[PDB]
Structure formats: structure tokens, C-alpha cells
Amino acid sequence: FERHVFRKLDHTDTGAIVTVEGSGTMDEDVPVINSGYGFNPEDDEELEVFLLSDGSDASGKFGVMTIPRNKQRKWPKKTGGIQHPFNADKFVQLDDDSIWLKDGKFTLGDNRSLSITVEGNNVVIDTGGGELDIRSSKLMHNGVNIGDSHVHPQQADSDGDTEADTDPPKRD
Amino acid sequence: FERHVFRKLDHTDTGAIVTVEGSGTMDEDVPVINSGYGFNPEDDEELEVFLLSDGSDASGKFGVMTIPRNKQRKWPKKTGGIQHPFNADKFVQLDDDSIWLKDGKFTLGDNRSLSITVEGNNVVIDTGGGELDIRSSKLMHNGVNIGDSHVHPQQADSDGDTEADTDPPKRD
Amino acid sequence: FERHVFRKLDHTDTGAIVTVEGSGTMDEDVPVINSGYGFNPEDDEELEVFLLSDGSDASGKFGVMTIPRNKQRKWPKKTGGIQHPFNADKFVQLDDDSIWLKDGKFTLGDNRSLSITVEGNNVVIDTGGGELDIRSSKLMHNGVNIGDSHVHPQQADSDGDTEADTDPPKRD
């Protein structure tokens, strides 16, 4: 077990190659362990990379990258999750109340087409890349039918001849 | 390498101070390797904490906190993801069918304003924060246009006179 | 410290037990430390599993599983997250631009009832016959009110001439 500090990370076919100081430990270190979480920090950024030696052989040293210590989120009690490796306020939380995500902009899909924003507590859903079709038995807004089964009542006309509720939305 | 049990965890500027028993290995075993996933367990939990010493130096020790042994989910074949640290029901799964999130409630945004729930197969989308605005070339419920371009057919009045299709929704 | 390949993973009450190919080092091995992220690979998969021993005692030794490196994602600079352990294009990214999820299908809830798709930007939201109820001070589409507070102007009767706007959508 030994301790060194990160400078440079490069990609290859079978993992990531890093140079982590501690003298010129190696220009191209043996690939790093992922275990599910990985990131690509910028060149020469504060963070530390522990190296584990295969047996006692100095020829093999797997790194264990860690989030920068200035940027570790102080999670609340009985909570956990993952976070942006360079900021403590863009994270994902799985709690006893609800699956909580925090960020100033949300996106989904292959090409980030489905974009959702919660700016100022409002809702701005943007999917301008195509059509929007919803399936649901009976739709509301504030508990009032606004979907495919609503009808608009009429009122008195110029001749005073009252009318009834109009027909539902047209079918193409 | 050595194994230990968890006693108490408190936050710190550049890590997480933890007591791990083992005859009191240290009142604050400051280092806690953070590779993306972390949590703040309650005092005196069943989970087991391993300690790793920098080289052979017994002064420096790094902890590797683990999910409690008695609360580990049994994932299905060809699946993986992160889970609620203290329960096997609230989790996230990335599979060959769909990005699956399981929980009894859903919240988003900076202050959980955008709240979504899925109870008893139903859908309850709450955005009490404020206004809701959607951008899309269409809005079709069950495949029927109810968006900004729908229009209502009209029927005969008390005078027997038939009108034409209604105008689109009023524009502010 | 040693390094080996994965052979077969079996579930058990105390955790997940995996047998590796260290000359049959153990058919019923010490479990895989579950630091949040875990997965259940198919039998005889190519991935590689390390193994550490509690102290120098060879009787007990924990292993740490790694994502197979032929399916390792090459994250962009200033980015990180978790991925599908068997594919590099099914992942979640927490960036400095937006919380990004990539997948051909999206599901939520206890039983995947709330299903969302973003195929070709053609947003398709399916609730499996559920009751979609939305709460918001004002619902809009393309910047036009189509919610619970929209009204429809109408046309001129035949011998009845003009008339006022319609009533709001019918209540239940």
C-alpha cells in the first residue's frame, strides 16, 4: 500500500492509464479499477490516488482514484448516494422520503432531446425535437378533466338560444 | 489489511472522522476513501468497516465502509446499480430493458419542488412551486390532440342552427 | 494482495459470494464488499476479480469485482458517473451542464408502470392505464394556456350571428 497524487489520466482500450507522482512512478500506469464509478479529472487537479501492488511485485500497481477532499459532500444522517466528483451540490440521493436529485438542468435520452428544468421552483419541460404523446385513462390539471374527455359548456348567444356542451377534441 | 466494526461517524472538512472499535483503533480514523458513493450511517450499526494502513506504517489507516451485511440486495442476473444503504427496496437499476428506479416517491430540483409519485399504478405529478410550461409540436392524449392546436366541434342550438368548428384555446 | 478472474456468483443471506479461478481458490468464497455498487454477471464472464486477505490469514479473503474492460466507457473530461456493467452506452452522467441519463427506455415506480420513452425525440409517456393528475398554477403548451383555465372563442351562428367565449372545461 502506498500514497501518491494525481496529475494526468489517459484512456486506452482496456481501462484508464494514469500518472500519479510519487517520483516518476510511471508514465503509463497499469489500468485502474472502476468498480462502477469513474471520472476523468482535469490535468493537475487536487486529488489523491492510492496504489495497490499485486502481491509484493513493484511491477503491478492498481490505482484507486478518490474525489478531491475539498469537494466531499457532508451527507445528512441516514442518507447516501453519488455526487458530481468536482462539486458537492450536484448529486443523487436515495432517502426514506424520496429519490432526490439536485441540479440546475435535467436531460434524458440518447441526444439530450428531452430537457426538463426546475428553475425558480417552476417547471419548463422542453422536448422540441419531436411530438409528445401521452397515454393515460383519464387526465387532469388540478383534478379537472383537461385530457381527451373534457367538454366545454356553452352560454347564451345573440338570439338568446342556449346551447349544450360542445364535442370533445377532434380525432385526426 | 484488517477488519473492524463501525461505532461512530462525524463530518470533517477533508474527509470523515470515524471510530471503528478494534480496541479503539483511533477516536477519529480521519481518512475514508470516497470513490463516488458514501453515506452517513446511524450510530452503532451492524455494518463492518475494513482498515488499510499506508504502507506498513501503523499510524495512517484508511477505512472502506460497506453496506450493512444484513441489508444487501440480491440483484438479478445481468443487472447492477446502487441501492439505498439501509434497505434493498429503494434502488436504481440500469438494465437491457430500461433505466429502472424504484421508490415510493420521486422528487427533483434544488428544493424538491418538482414532486412525482407513482401510487397504486396511478400517477400524481405535483409541481406546487409554480407555473408549468411545455414545449412540443403536439400534445396527444391517448393519441388525440389536446394541446395548443385542438378545436371543438359544435352542435345545433335551440334555434336549430349549426355552427362550425370552435377556435383554438384563447391566447393571453 | 492477489488477482484472479470471475467464475460464478451465488447469492446468500450474509451477502454475495463469488468463486474465482485461483486454482479453485474457493467454491464458496468470502463475499464481495458492497460499497453501494454491485452487479450479478453471467457465468464464466471475462471480468477480473482481485482478492485481499484479512491480515495475513489466508483462511478469509475478500474480493473486489471490476467492470470488464472490453466494455469500459471512456468518460469525457470533467465528467463521471456509473454505467451498465455490461455496456458502455447505458449510463448516468452528472456533469456541470445537466444531469444526463442515456438509455433507449425509461421506467419508474414500484412495478415499472410509469414508462417514458424518448425514441427519436418522439416523447412517449405511458402510465399503464393509470390516472394522470397534474397540480400546477397554470398549464401551458408552446407558450399557450391549454390547462384548467383556458377558454375557447367561438364563431357566428347561422341567423344567430356572434356569441361570447365558451365556459371552462366541464367539472366532474
A164 at interface of C, judged by CB pairs closer than 8 A = no
Whose cell is 487537479? That residue is A45
B36 → closest Cβ in C80, C128, C137: C80
- Tell me if chain C has a CB within 8 Å of the CB of B2: yes
Chain B contact for A62 (CB, 8 A cutoff):
no
The answer to whether B19 and B29 are in contact (CB under 8 A) is yes
CA-to-CA distance for B89 and C123, rounded, in angstroms? Answer: 28
Distance from CA of A33 to the nearest CA of B (A): 11
Measure the CA–CA gap between B136 and A126, rounded to whole angstroms.
Answer: 7
Q: Which residue has the cell 400524481?
A: B124
DSSP assignment of A56-81 equals T-TT-EEEEE---GGG---PPSS-EE
**d(Cα B8, Cα B28) in Å, to the nearest integer?**
9
With H, G, I as helix, E, B as strand and everything else as coil, classify residue A171. Answer: coil
B24 Cβ neighbours under 8 A, 6+ residues apart:
none
Distance CA B159, CA C158 (A): 9
> Does B36 contact A148 at a Cβ distance shorter than 8 Å?
no
Please name every residue paired with B100 in a beta bridge, in sequence order, or none if there are none: B93, C107
Q: What is residue C157's DSSP assignment?
A: B
Quick check: helix, strand or coil at residue B69?
helix
Q: A117: closest CA among B109, B125, B118?
A: B109
Residue A36 C-alpha cell reads as 462502477
Q: Provide the pairing of β-strand C99-102 with A106-107.
A: parallel
Q: Cβ–Cβ of B154/A135 closer than 8 Å? A: no
Cell reading at A102: 439536485
CA-based radius of gyration for chain A: 28
A59 inside 8 A of chain B by CB: no
Which three three-digit cell numbers place residue B161? 342552427
User: Which residues, including other chains, have CB under 8 Å from residue B98's CB and lie 6 or more apart?
Assistant: C103, C104, C105, C106, C107, C112, C115
H-helix or E-strand containing C78? none
Are B137 and C120 in contact, with CB atoms under 8 Å apart?
Answer: no
List the strands of the sheet with B48-53, edge to edge: B2-5, B48-53, B61-65
Cell numbers at C86, concatenated: 455490461
Distance in Å, alpha carbon of A32 to nearest chain C alpha carbon:
10
Residues in CB range of B79: below 8 A, 6 or more apart: B93, B94, B95, C39, C40
The Cα A20–Cα A43 span in angstroms is 11
Run of H or E residues at B128: none
d(CA A12, CA A28): 10
**Sequence-separated contacts (24+) of C4-12 with Cβ below 8 Å:** C4/C48, C4/C49, C4/C50, C4/C51, C4/C63, C5/C46, C5/C47, C5/C48, C5/C49, C6/C41, C6/C45, C6/C47, C6/C48, C6/C49, C6/C65, C7/C43, C7/C44, C8/C43, C8/C44, C9/C40, C9/C41, C11/B74, C11/C40
* C-alpha cell of residue A71: 469537494
Nearest residue to A169 (alpha-carbon basis) of B121, B93, B14, B145: B145
Bridge partners of A170, per DSSP, are: none
For residues B117 and C109, what is the distance between their CA atoms, to the nearest angstrom?
8
Cell match 458537492: residue? A88
Q: Cα dist. A28→A31, A32, B9, C49 in Å? A: 8, 11, 37, 22
Element (H, E) at B3: strand B2-5
**Chains contacting A (3+ CB pairs below 8 angstroms):** B, C
Whether the CB of B166 is below 8 Å from some CB of chain C: the reply is yes
In terms of CA atoms, which chain A residue is nearest residue C133? A140
For C161, the closest of A38, A138, A158 (CB atoms) is: A158
Q: CB neighbours of A16 closer than 8 A, spacing ≥ 6? A: A9, A10, A31, A32, A38, A40, C72
Our CA-based measurement puts residue B30 at a distance from the nearest CA of chain C, in whole angstroms, of: 18
CB-based contact, B110 to chain C, within 8 Å? no
Cβ pair A22, A3 in contact under 8 A: yes
Q: Where are the beta strands (DSSP E) in chain A?
A: 2-5, 8-12, 15-19, 37-39, 48-53, 61-65, 80-83, 91-94, 99-101, 106-107, 115-117, 123-126, 132-135, 140-141, 144-145
User: What torsion, rounded to 10 degrees, do the Cα atoms C72, C75, C79, C80 define?
Assistant: 0
B169 and A CB contact within 8 Å: no
Q: Is C112 within 8 Å of chain B by CB?
A: yes
CB atoms within 10 A of CB A73: 21
Using an 8 Å CB-CB cutoff, list chain A residues near C41. none
Q: Which chains touch C (3 or more CB pairs under 8 A)?
A: A, B
Residue C151 dihedral angles phi and psi, to the nearest 5°: -130, 150
Q: For B50, name the nearest residue in chain C, comparing CA atoms only.
A: C54
